[PDB]
Amino acid sequence: SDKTFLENNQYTDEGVKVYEFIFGENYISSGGLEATKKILSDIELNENSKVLDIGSGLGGGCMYINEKYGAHTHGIDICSNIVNMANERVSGNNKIIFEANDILTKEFPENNFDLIYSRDAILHLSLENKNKLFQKCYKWLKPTGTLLITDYCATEKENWDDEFKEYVKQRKYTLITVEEYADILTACNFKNVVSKDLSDYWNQLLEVEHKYLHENKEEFLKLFSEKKFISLDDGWSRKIKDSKRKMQRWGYFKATKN
Ligand SMILES: Nc1ncnc2c1ncn2[C@@H]1O[C@H](CSCC[C@H](N)C(=O)O)[C@@H](O)[C@H]1O
Ligand SMILES: CCN(CC)Cc1cc(Nc2ccnc3cc(Cl)ccc23)ccc1O
Ligand SMILES: CCN(CC)Cc1cc(Nc2ccnc3cc(Cl)ccc23)ccc1O
């Protein structure tokens, strides 16, 4: 599937390390540890709780959830190179496992998890694939369970410019509106569906990251190339510009089963 594509483009080892430089250790998405603390601030779990992280990446989210709650965390990520990196950071901790697998082919028992959690990963999935995932997610949640998601969203396609279309095409993203996304969750039988466009906050995160990149660019070049620097600088500039003009949006979704 998109495995070899992702492993050999956006999520190369070098690419992942660059992301870590800007998001912080163990994170490859928006706001790293700080945003994660915010996203989980109203979430209640204990040591016996069971957590699924969809697209767990370098594992920072699972580590934080286990650190904060003592919960059992199980991360699934389709990139084997990323999974291997994550595994090497949690070798001592038996309540944190990662597994290399497409979440779509992954099989789980019904009523399994207290929390199903995903941060900026579901944008990789086609529209059809987003639907079957959430139906599988519904099954997997215990009756007392919560689904918790951040994901890239967008304005309708008639408002995309050429550059945004090209970015979405070459990254093989499928981006829908916050409303279209919320619609899928209700269609997949979830209750208490809560949707928020967090683009103002996302823009603040991107700004901190962008400033941080420039402030620490000497340390950056010590580890990476000037080519990788320009590319990253350029990409953040565009995400900042596009969230400002409401073209690219950051969706937050929180839902239950009953
Ligand atoms: N079909 C799929 N199944 C499982 N993981 C997938 C997937 N499609 C994309 N991914 C993964 O989703 C991750 C998105 S990047 C963000 C990773 C992590 N949630 C964090 O915030 O740091 C990537 O590591 C990618 O490999
Ligand atoms: C290298 C690791 N760093 C980047 C500077 C992580 C990181 C921190 C931030 N800072 C912040 C995140 C969330 N809330 C914040 C609130 C305030 Cl008043 C200040 C900084 C915040 C933003 C993005 C980001 O990626
Ligand atoms: C000459 C100008 N061209 C180069 C071919 C610039 C150009 C950049 C892009 N890259 C991008 C456009 C919008 N958002 C982006 C976000 C990120 Cl994280 C990275 C690249 C982006 C796409 C098409 C395009 O034509």
The amino acid occupying position 158 is: E
Q: Which long-range contacts (CB under 8 A, 24 or more apart) does 217-221 make?
A: 220/21
How many structural domains is the chain composed of? 1
Compute the distance between CA of residue 51 and CA of residue 115 in angstroms, rounded to an integer. Answer: 5
Name the experimental technique: X-ray
- Is position 74 annotated as part of the catalytic site? no
CA nearest to 53, candidates 17, 24, 26, 88: 26
Structure token digits, residue 6: 């992702």
Range of the domain at 4: 1-258
Closest Cα to atom 13 of ligand 3: 164
Ligand 1 binding pocket (C-beta < 6 A) is: 6, 11, 27-29, 55-57, 60-61, 76-79, 82, 102-104, 119-121, 124-125
Tell me the backbone φ, ψ of residue 113, rounded to 5 degrees: -115, 145
CB-count burial class (<10 Å; 0-12, 13-18, 19+) for 17: middle
Overall residue count recorded for the chain in this entry: 258
- Is position 124 annotated as part of the catalytic site? yes
Whichever domain contains 48, its CATH number is 3.40.50.150
Cβ atoms within 10 Å of 230's Cβ, excluding its own = 10
The structure was resolved to a resolution in Å of 2.0
Cβ atoms within 10 Å of 249's Cβ, excluding its own = 21
Among 163, 171, 249, residue to substitute to test ligand 3 (most atoms within 8 Å of Cβ): 163
CA nearest to 133, candidates 151, 107, 99: 107
